[PDB]
RNA sequence: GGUUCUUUGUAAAGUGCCUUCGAAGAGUCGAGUUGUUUGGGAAUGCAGCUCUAAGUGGGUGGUAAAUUCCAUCUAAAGCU
RNA sequence: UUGACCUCAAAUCAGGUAGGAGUACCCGCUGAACUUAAGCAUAUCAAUAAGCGGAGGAAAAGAAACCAACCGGGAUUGCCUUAGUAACGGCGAGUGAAGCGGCAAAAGCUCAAAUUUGAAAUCUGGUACCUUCGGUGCCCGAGUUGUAAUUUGGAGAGGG
């Protein structure tokens, strides 16, 4: 974390008394609030599932995690969003199957 | 219009010529040759009081 | 100025110094760098070898400020002191009071070892030094201080 | 056509470049205009000093981080530590920059101190007073110049600890180059057996 | 408030509730005129966040525009030039269908100014848009300083000049290295980079 | 420079500490493909079509991808 | 039968507004070829000319989904420079920016997402009188499918 004082190496840079400024508010975007979590959860049961989400739920039960992630990456645009989509399709399947 | 009109001169060479021009004002033969009527002037350089 | 040009001397002469046979034309060999591999090839290989083809790996988005590292030799190292202050350090080549030279504030990145500094100890603050530049500074009694 | 032994030129004039020739004939005319504009603004805002007080900041990149220059504006933490608000500071000729952050104590201390001379050298006229005359000073930068810090002293003792600074540089970059390899090796050496 | 639920509901475009609503609404817009006045926004949440106020002087129009590429309007596909410009079919208009929608509404309602616009529906043949317009002559707009900026003459036909949201997006007006060609306008950037700057004392 | 309106105010605003919070833009981002454009090179921007988001999230970090971090801003609304 | 509401109409209804000219400069669309490559098709000319739409005294851009990788800078624009460079290109002809640095000028902000809910507190128009770029009272209307106050991320809000 602290600089080494020399011009090359792992932590190259001038050693300076650090200050750790106060965290900003803009650095909080995306963070879920109590109200917004309530609205997004309520809308999910009002609106239901998308046709591709129904497919991912079926593929998770039938073809496994890897095939579901491959189809999710095709439907979405990225492998990272395919994980988050398969992760919360697992959550819906977990809640539906239980009780 | 984009013909070169102004000419760059080195600052030290501009100063060089200015110092030469000042020193040439003290030579009465050069002043006489330049066309000035300093034939009956008391002395060159001509220095007058600050009251002027 | 125009009055000193050969165009003034070519007045009265038919071809203006361009010849009656050659008969000065628009672009007899092509324009610009035309035919560098075909009809101007000999001129290229004679005077610009290496022109055609590719050389090593590319560098997308090169920032020359990364590679800023002005080099300073040891024979110019003592020029970083002002000259009136410089003489009283050359006399009394002593430790416990040695000139501190910040080569960064003078705008240098690496100290190189062209060599033959005087035998006066000198404190050198340098971002980089060559191995031999370090040998000659220590041989004079000084030390190289690494900074960033 | 390629000719005798001359360097290869790259004169980019194969477009209609004569339609976009800007000759700065107005260079003397524009200089008079800016001086008239500066004199016009000075009379308009008299006795305010024609510009805002700016902080001292470290220049970025490794080529220029040896210098300090004038920044855009003081940070919210700098104005706070000088005992005034950002909204009020903007009204007495202080430049406030909300997006700059302070991670350097000496830059912050210099800028906080910089704010303290400025408040001690200006007088704020009353909003409903008699406004005593104050013989307008035209420049705030020339009244509060930016000064480079003193990195070290003129002369001191030679302290040679046998470090071999060149060898220090060689080992420092060698440690960085082979750290990732030496971290796989440490990972597998603990995992094996 | 309810505008947050409307915002989260509008996002799930493939739910059964919105598949029905978009099917019924796309039929209604085909049976109406290509440009027609809307009595109210069908997306009051989206209109609000684009600056629509529910007061006198704010007008919503609805418009549909033909989808697809811009076929080159040359006779019989014959271009007279080099083969690099012989393309006719797969050529794309440089402005969004939203931008074309804004101009056609703006020409129809030349007494107003286009503020913003938003997608409402689409089928294979059309994309459907609702355009927010503000009346600069209405006294409710001329006072109330939050919106009287658009009464200035400099804001006549922002949609024709690309000053709206989709107009600035298609012009490329964004910060950073990705938009070096288009930050302050690419024609001004090109003019500056293709200008010979000659000083009195030549550098 | 001055001259009235002086209930032209508990009306406005700022300043300290604790606690609970902290809503922040969707056929949009992003992705594929096609065309165009750029110095932008496994793709710089733009546009058509298809898919189509999340919320310690999203974008960017000028070589595609996976894994682990780090840095930096806060888009998809607006004025000057 | 009657009274609403929603949507859509009509009027030489009351008051407005648009067109067109100019178009040097400005914001976009569309878009060549002559030319260069000693031929020529990619390329170049050129993201130019012509064509089309739209403004102002400037326009546009503009207060970061920025640059960076530093001890970090800090809206936009323009000048000097970076730099004929990194890079692109039958890697041919040719093309070709950006960061930093120094200057000129400097200026900052506004909405949407929050229950005023013990008070739609908001606004157009008509009419009457005035101290008439407007004000006051009254009335009709708009508006709760949200007009005001309060907050815009730098924060800020509730409570104490
Ligand atoms: Mg002869
Ligand atoms: Mg003859
Ligand atoms: Mg002849
Ligand atoms: Mg041959
Ligand atoms: Mg061609
Ligand atoms: Mg000049
Ligand atoms: Mg936002
Ligand atoms: Mg085109
Ligand atoms: Mg091209
Ligand atoms: Mg930073
Ligand atoms: Mg009428
Ligand atoms: Mg333009
Ligand atoms: Mg040819
Ligand atoms: Mg030829
Ligand atoms: Mg081009
Ligand atoms: Mg033209
Ligand atoms: Mg005009
Ligand atoms: Mg001006
Ligand atoms: Mg403007
Ligand atoms: Mg603007
Ligand atoms: Mg901001
Ligand atoms: Mg900047
Ligand atoms: Mg390319
Ligand atoms: Mg080009
Ligand atoms: Mg307040």
Curated annotation (Swiss-Prot), chain A:
Record keyword Ribosomal protein present: yes
PTM characteristics: N-terminally acetylated by acetyltransferase NatA.
Xref: Gene3D superfamilies: 60S ribosomal protein L36
GO function term, MF aspect, one: RNA binding
One Pfam family it belongs to: Ribosomal_L36e
Location in or out of the cell: Cytoplasm
One GO term describing the cellular component: cytosolic large ribosomal subunit
Main subcellular location: cytoplasm
Residue(s) carrying N-acetylthreonine: 1
PROSITE patterns for the chain: RIBOSOMAL_L36E
GO biological process, alphabetically ordered: cytoplasmic translation
InterPro entries noted in UniProt: Ribosomal_eL36, Ribosomal_eL36_sf
UniProt keyword terms in alphabetical order: Acetylation, Cytoplasm, Ribonucleoprotein, Ribosomal protein
Presence of the UniProt keyword Acetylation in the record: yes
Function: Component of the ribosome, a large ribonucleoprotein complex responsible for the synthesis of proteins in the cell. The small ribosomal subunit (SSU) binds messenger RNAs (mRNAs) and translates the encoded message by selecting cognate aminoacyl-transfer RNA (tRNA) molecules. The large subunit (LSU) contains the ribosomal catalytic site termed the peptidyl transferase center (PTC), which catalyzes the formation of peptide bonds, thereby polymerizing the amino acids delivered by tRNAs into a polypeptide chain.
Assembly behavior: Component of the large ribosomal subunit (LSU). Mature yeast ribosomes consist of a small (40S) and a large (60S) subunit. The 40S small subunit contains 1 molecule of ribosomal RNA (18S rRNA) and 33 different proteins (encoded by 57 genes). The large 60S subunit contains 3 rRNA molecules (25S, 5.8S and 5S rRNA) and 46 different proteins (encoded by 81 genes).
Family: Belongs to the eukaryotic ribosomal protein eL36 family.
Gene: RPL36A
Curated annotation (Swiss-Prot), chain C:
Residue interval(s) of motif Nuclear localization signal: 6-12, 23-29
Domain of life of the native organism: Eukaryota
Subcellular location(s) per record: Cytoplasm
GO-annotated molecular function: RNA binding; structural constituent of ribosome
Gene Ontology BP terms: cytoplasmic translation
UniProt feature, compositional bias: Basic residues: 1-13, 20-29
Segment forming the signal sequence: none
SUPFAM superfamilies from the UniProt entry: Ribosomal proteins L15p and L18e (SSF52080)
Cross-link (Glycyl lysine isopeptide (Lys-Gly) (interchain with G-Cter in ubiquitin)): 95
Disordered: region residues: 1-38
Cellular component, GO, one term: cytosol
Residues in coiled coil: none
Pfam families associated with the record: Ribosomal_L27A
Keywords associated with the record: Cytoplasm, Isopeptide bond, Ribonucleoprotein, Ribosomal protein, Ubl conjugation
Summary of subunit composition and partner proteins: Component of the large ribosomal subunit (LSU). Mature yeast ribosomes consist of a small (40S) and a large (60S) subunit. The 40S small subunit contains 1 molecule of ribosomal RNA (18S rRNA) and 33 different proteins (encoded by 57 genes). The large 60S subunit contains 3 rRNA molecules (25S, 5.8S and 5S rRNA) and 46 different proteins (encoded by 81 genes).
Protein family per UniProt: Belongs to the universal ribosomal protein uL15 family.
PANTHER family cross-referenced by the UniProt entry: 60S RIBOSOMAL PROTEIN L27A (PTHR11721), LARGE RIBOSOMAL SUBUNIT PROTEIN UL15 (PTHR11721:SF3)
This protein's name: Large ribosomal subunit protein uL15
Swiss-Prot record, chain D:
Subcellular localization: Cytoplasm
Pfam family, one: Ribosomal_L13e
The keyword Ribonucleoprotein appears for this protein: yes
Gene Ontology CC: cytosol; cytosolic large ribosomal subunit
GO biological process: cytoplasmic translation
Record-annotated membrane-spanning stretches: none
Keywords, alphabetical: Cytoplasm, Phosphoprotein, Ribonucleoprotein, Ribosomal protein
Assembly and binders: Component of the large ribosomal subunit (LSU). Mature yeast ribosomes consist of a small (40S) and a large (60S) subunit. The 40S small subunit contains 1 molecule of ribosomal RNA (18S rRNA) and 33 different proteins (encoded by 57 genes). The large 60S subunit contains 3 rRNA molecules (25S, 5.8S and 5S rRNA) and 46 different proteins (encoded by 81 genes).
Family the entry assigns: Belongs to the eukaryotic ribosomal protein eL13 family.
Note: Present with 133000 molecules/cell in log phase SD medium.
Function: Component of the ribosome, a large ribonucleoprotein complex responsible for the synthesis of proteins in the cell. The small ribosomal subunit (SSU) binds messenger RNAs (mRNAs) and translates the encoded message by selecting cognate aminoacyl-transfer RNA (tRNA) molecules. The large subunit (LSU) contains the ribosomal catalytic site termed the peptidyl transferase center (PTC), which catalyzes the formation of peptide bonds, thereby polymerizing the amino acids delivered by tRNAs into a polypeptide chain.
Protein name per its UniProtKB record: Large ribosomal subunit protein eL13A
Lineage, opening ranks: Eukaryota, Fungi, Dikarya, Ascomycota, Saccharomycotina
From Swiss-Prot, chain E:
UniProt-recorded Gene Ontology molecular function terms: RNA binding; structural constituent of ribosome
Pfam families per record: Ribosomal_L15e
Keyword Ribosomal protein included in the entry's annotation: yes
Subcellular location: Cytoplasm
Keyword vocabulary terms for this entry: Cytoplasm, Ribonucleoprotein, Ribosomal protein
Biased composition (Basic residues): 168-184
Domain of life: Eukaryota
GO biological process, one term: cytoplasmic translation
Alphabetical list of InterPro entries matching this protein: Rbsml_eL15_core_dom_sf, Ribosomal_eL15, Ribosomal_eL15_CS, Ribosomal_uL23/eL15/eS24_sf
Chain intervals for the UniProt region annotation (Disordered): 163-184
Classification via SMART domains: Ribosomal_L15e
Task performed by this protein: Component of the ribosome, a large ribonucleoprotein complex responsible for the synthesis of proteins in the cell. The small ribosomal subunit (SSU) binds messenger RNAs (mRNAs) and translates the encoded message by selecting cognate aminoacyl-transfer RNA (tRNA) molecules. The large subunit (LSU) contains the ribosomal catalytic site termed the peptidyl transferase center (PTC), which catalyzes the formation of peptide bonds, thereby polymerizing the amino acids delivered by tRNAs into a polypeptide chain.
Summary of subunit composition and partner proteins: Component of the large ribosomal subunit (LSU). Mature yeast ribosomes consist of a small (40S) and a large (60S) subunit. The 40S small subunit contains 1 molecule of ribosomal RNA (18S rRNA) and 33 different proteins (encoded by 57 genes). The large 60S subunit contains 3 rRNA molecules (25S, 5.8S and 5S rRNA) and 46 different proteins (encoded by 81 genes).
Note: There are 2 genes for eL15 in yeast.
Protein name: Large ribosomal subunit protein eL15A
